[PDB]
Amino acid sequence: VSPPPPIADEPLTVNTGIYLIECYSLDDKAETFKVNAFLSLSWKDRRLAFDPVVRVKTYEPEAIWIPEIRFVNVENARDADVVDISVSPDGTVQYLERFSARVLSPLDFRRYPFDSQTLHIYLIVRSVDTRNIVLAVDLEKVGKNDDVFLTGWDIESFTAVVKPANFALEDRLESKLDYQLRISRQYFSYIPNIILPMLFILFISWTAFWSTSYEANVTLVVSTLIAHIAFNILVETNLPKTPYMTYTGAIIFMIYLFYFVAVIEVTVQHYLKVESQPARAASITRASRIAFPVVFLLANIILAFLFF
Amino acid sequence: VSPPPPIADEPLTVNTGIYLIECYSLDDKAETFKVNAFLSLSWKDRRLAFDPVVRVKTYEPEAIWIPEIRFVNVENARDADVVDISVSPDGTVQYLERFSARVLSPLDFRRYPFDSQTLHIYLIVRSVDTRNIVLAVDLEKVGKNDDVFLTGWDIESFTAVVKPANFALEDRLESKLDYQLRISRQYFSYIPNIILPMLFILFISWTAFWSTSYEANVTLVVSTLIAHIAFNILVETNLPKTPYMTYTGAIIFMIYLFYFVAVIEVTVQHYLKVESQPARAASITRASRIAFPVVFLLANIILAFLFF
Amino acid sequence: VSPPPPIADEPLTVNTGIYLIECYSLDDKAETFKVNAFLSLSWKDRRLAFDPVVRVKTYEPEAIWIPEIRFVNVENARDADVVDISVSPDGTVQYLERFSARVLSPLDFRRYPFDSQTLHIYLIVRSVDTRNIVLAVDLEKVGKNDDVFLTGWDIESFTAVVKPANFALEDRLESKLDYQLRISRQYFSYIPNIILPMLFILFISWTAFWSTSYEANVTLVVSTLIAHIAFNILVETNLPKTPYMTYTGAIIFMIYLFYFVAVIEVTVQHYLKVESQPARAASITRASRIAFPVVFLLANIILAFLFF
Amino acid sequence: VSPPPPIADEPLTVNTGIYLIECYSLDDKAETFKVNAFLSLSWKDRRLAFDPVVRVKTYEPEAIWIPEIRFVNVENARDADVVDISVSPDGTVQYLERFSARVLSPLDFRRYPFDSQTLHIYLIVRSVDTRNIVLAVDLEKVGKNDDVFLTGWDIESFTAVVKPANFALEDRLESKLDYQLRISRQYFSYIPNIILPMLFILFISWTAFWSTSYEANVTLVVSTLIAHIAFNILVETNLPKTPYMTYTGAIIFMIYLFYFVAVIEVTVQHYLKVESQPARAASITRASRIAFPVVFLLANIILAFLFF
Amino acid sequence: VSPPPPIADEPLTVNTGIYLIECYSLDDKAETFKVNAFLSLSWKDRRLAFDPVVRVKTYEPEAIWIPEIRFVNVENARDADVVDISVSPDGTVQYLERFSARVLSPLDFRRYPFDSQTLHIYLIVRSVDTRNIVLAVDLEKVGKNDDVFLTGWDIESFTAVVKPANFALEDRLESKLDYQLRISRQYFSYIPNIILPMLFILFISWTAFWSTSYEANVTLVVSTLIAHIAFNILVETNLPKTPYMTYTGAIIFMIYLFYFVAVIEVTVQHYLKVESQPARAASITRASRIAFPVVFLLANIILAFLFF
């Protein structure tokens, strides 16, 4: 079946939209999120006018020519299924189908608990006799209401824009259509799960500055280092790979450095106290009591400024 | 093959049911549970009357028109197989098939050991010449007897109701059918596996309030913190992702906070006892002995009230 | 192709069997074990008699009607392939095929190291003109010789019985065929891997009853608790989910309780010894030396009686 | 298409071979290794003689009859693709295809770092008019050159032999063909990764025999037990399931037993030294210094003899 | 459809290229990386000349003969889809398709944080009437712009060369085409995540050379060994299998050896200090203070020289 003949006044501007249904899978490490949503198309063509002698008409999927719409960014062609084709008697085709696919949106965990991500879908079509203006979207058919699913994100925006980019070959003048879904993580879940316990263990380490027993100080600091490594093991099963950097990955390095400095300070204090310099050891101890929380706050503020 | 012609008195009300067979897979993190069950349809159509010149008749799956029934919430179209079609001589079609699919029911682990979940299946059909009343269910063909499988849930209810909701496009007046399976976790397995050992380790930590040795107190409290983090590592392999909150996830935070407060109290007691205030240190120690279990019980009751 | 016409004396009793080849995959958590075995069918039909003017005849899989045999309990229809069809000149069809599928047998880890499981396969067929007696098995074509594979089980029995159970719809009088494979775990591998080291760590904890140093006692008991949690982490990667209970899962809880009681006893002994009651502390210590192994043996015997 | 007619002098002896390309996947726990290799067949048939009026001829895969060659041991039928069919003018067919499949070779980790395994492939064919002698292999077309891939094995032998074994039904006289690939692990990688650090931690434990401090001895031995359990956790992610036994799995049990005996010795020494028997305690301590390395060497030699 | 007839002057030299789109999956342990890219072909053939009585022409994928191009190194045949065929009126075919497949490039983690890898793609074609010169590449259609994806690599080179290698059978004179993509890891992410914390824990261990307390020294060194094993557990989830060797895997062994030597030195110092040799113990202690960092630097330089 060939596309309907044009009037040559303008290329066939097919209206398209995608109503999200279930963006269920979020493979952060694989940078692939899997969705099973619905896509709706509406375009003008010659059909049953029924002005003389209705309500709605429905043909078969293999009868009417449907424009070939494909996603640039998928592991494989979308697992789709034609749901409802409406040949409106005023004259148009309304083709609604249900597709499921992996979308291949590269997440960016530069600021992991407080990240704002943008899922991307790129639409392309082929040209047979004339170009296509598929990017014309009514912005009314798109949108998922909500569900409290394993996706703990809050949806901010669903902008859809025409972004003509350079193709792999660029043989034709085809322009892809951009669906950008900007979402924000609900970070409250992570404050008592990844952030607060780490600070608690760090403060347990710091409680070694109010003690004079070198052996108890060593127990506190090194057992706290072990506890922090174990808690990092616990946390990193939740975190993605992140082979570049992270805000919460630099706080962990800061905490490692602070354990190192705490060990150094405890050793220095004990060396001074054994070398018969109790006054200097006490001065260093009190300075550490004041300084370690202060330096930690300063480092956290500096890291927040660097990342945010 | 076209649907049988109607009398125009009422739309074709096809009776449907699903008899659960094996809801074997429960991917909590993926929020997908996989089932391989049977679906039965019964509807009126013209066929062999056999009033003159039986028992049962059976046609081929590709011969009789079967209504297109699809699931709203699946990763892919159900992997089905026609099992038995019965063209009853009194006149009807009884189409029983075996399908297997992922159902995409978002679990809700707000109260993980004591959760009551509701698995959801949505049914939709297409319209060719007249609407359909598929939601008419006899409620007799549905139901799985039981099996002591890896599913440790106790089935409470299997309500099936007609829930006309807004579709993605809502071009037609199609109404989906709701299958809701309300089940409850058997929580007894978790009391001696996730709950009691954590309390045992916490009480081991608290046994540091009956001691005067600061170094032994530090050993108890910090080694117990390490043990609690290791036990949390052990537990979280069983738990799902839960990127929002949890009842058992807030008890863990409470236990972390209690370890922090225990360390603070031990340090305060040692500081007072070294600063030549044994009376105040002993008073704080006895108050802690009384208070820590009491505050833990109060916090647990408050959390239970907040979550239940 | 239609089934061969009957004599109406008796329904077509097709003989069936399955010769196991490789039951390679055992997904205990998923409760699915994957096998790639052979199935053989033998039944009477009209064919080349060759009494006048052999040895064997072979037709094409798409030529002869083969009864539709399906498995009740599979994720998807078996990935089969026709291997050899023998139209014996005396008159019969011998259809041997190689199928691979997941079998969906729910394991039961109530007694994990010493469990005896029963893998189940259910066979069903469709009826076109007359019923079928597929359950008639010669019990001679079934059976795998052996292999020392990743399956560490010892095969006990391969009983095959006719078990007419209620179907999902029960429209026809079809009766399924039961293949039950009863196997037993070789538990010797687990005694030096899951059982003996746990007892060794527990006894290391108990060696704190032969000491008077409270701080060394705390080190022994709490570091042993940490070691036991780490060993439980090591073990549970081997174990399945078991969301209900386990014999080896209740021994772990008993060991947790014994660590708790050991900490309590050590704290009581130190409190008495500090409160100037060395005689009572020594009496409690000696009683603990005698009692802890005795109570552990009694608890283990009680648990064995409860589970076995 | 039917097989070419025979001369009845001998059955059609088709020459076969498989040239390994990428045996990339080695799922030790699943006992399945996945390979994507090439298979070549050569057999005599009537074709273009071209003695009057060449170089080579090529037909279509669906035109020439190719013998049905299947693998006994695969999860599913090989994912193959016809690559090159050469109808040599002297008269023969040379059919080379690229197949990828899981091979289902049960590994045997009785001696894990020093194991020598034998990957197995079984070939079977069907008979239509005459038997087949497929087992006739030239042994020249087989073989992979090499690659330094994730397979850290050194290939020893590629023996291919005719092994007529009892089939599942044995209706015909078909004989399978055996491809056995004997390979050996490069064990050097494991000496500094699984073996040497464990010995280092054990010796750290033994350094408690040169000390008189019971509390420091307890710290050494029990913290070393914790370290050994953590290192076992680290190692076992690399190791397969091994539900039967292992050489490196019995060394771990020996090390657990040695930690138990070390704790027992330390407790005995402290009990004697507290009970006012310093001479006996020192004698036991020196005997332990001499004996523990000696007994460990003896146990390792005994285990090596038992396993090798 | 047959390939277009040749002029016999030269074999059909089809120009080919692949424009990378998403090399998203990098299964280091499996040694398979999955890409969904575009491939473009351009070749001369007889078609619409349109010199008398254009712009572009497009046929159907099943109409024009397209050369059979296959990848030597894939798990399965590429999941491709024809995108755009351009029959240029000057006379040529430009066939652009989108394929997704696993590429089977064996990574080489001899120097894990600082590795430079070379992903390999091998192209082969079949011969029907004449040979092919597919290796003729314009080097202009290839190339991915960039994306900050889960791939943390920096692309260095995209060399494409003709590498005629020995085939599995080498029946024809076919020559494969080599696509080599040389990339380099961005190692900065790993310095504060795998390298610096390990050094921090090692230095914490070394702080035991500035102390005289044997029990505190044991606490430092053995608790630091536990911390290092836990951190190795944390790191190895990121690392691949590496069953041969590694630069970062030999630093870990060096650190294990240094913990062993630190324990030995502490034990020697305590033995000398107890055996009434404080001068020798102090001399060994100071020599260790100087030597351990020096020997560690020397060992690291030696390892870097050996690996780089």
Numbering used by the authors:
A (entry chain D), B (entry chain E), C (entry chain A), D (entry chain B), E (entry chain C): 5 to 57, 61 to 315
Sentences from the paper on this structure:
The extracellular domain (ECD) of each subunit contains β-strands β1–β10, with the characteristic Cys- or Pro-loop connecting β6–β7, and loops A–F enclosing a canonical ligand-binding site at the interface between principal and complementary subunits. The transmembrane domain (TMD) contains α-helices M1–M4, with M2 lining the channel pore, and an intracellular domain of varying length (2–80 residues) inserted between M3 and M4. GLIC has been thoroughly documented as a proton-gated ion channel, conducting currents in response to low extracellular pH with half-maximal activation around pH 5 (8).
Taking advantage of the flexible buffer conditions accessible to cryo-EM, we obtained additional reconstructions under partial and maximal (pH 5 and pH 3) activating conditions, producing maps to 3.4 and 3.6 Å, respectively. Surprisingly, backbone alignments of models at both pH 5 and pH 3 indicated close fits to the pH-7 model (root mean-squared deviation over non-loop Cα atoms, Root mean-squared deviation [RMSD] ≤ 0.6 Å) in both the ECD and TMD, including a closed conformation of the transmembrane pore. At pH 7 and pH 5, little definitive density was associated with this side chain (left, center); conversely at pH 3, it clearly extended towards the complementary loop F, forming a possible hydrogen bond with T158 (3.5 Å donor–acceptor). At the midpoint of the same β1–β2 loop, density surrounding basic residue K33 was similarly absent at pH 7 and pH 5, but clearly defined a side chain oriented down towards the TMD at pH 3. Conversely, at pH 5 and pH 3, K248 reoriented out towards the complementary subunit. Residue K248 has been implicated in GLIC ECD-TMD coupling, while E243 was shown to be an important proton sensor; indeed, rearrangement of K248 to an interfacial orientation is also evident in open X-ray structures, with an accompanying iris-like motion of the M2–M3 region—including both K248 and E243—outward from the channel pore. Interestingly, loop F adopted a different conformation in our structures at pH 5 compared to pH 7 or pH 3, suggesting this region samples a range of conformations; indeed, previous spin-labeling studies indicated this position, along with several neighbors on the β8 strand, to be highly dynamic. Thus, side chain arrangements in both the ECD and TMD were consistent with proton activation, while maintaining a closed pore.
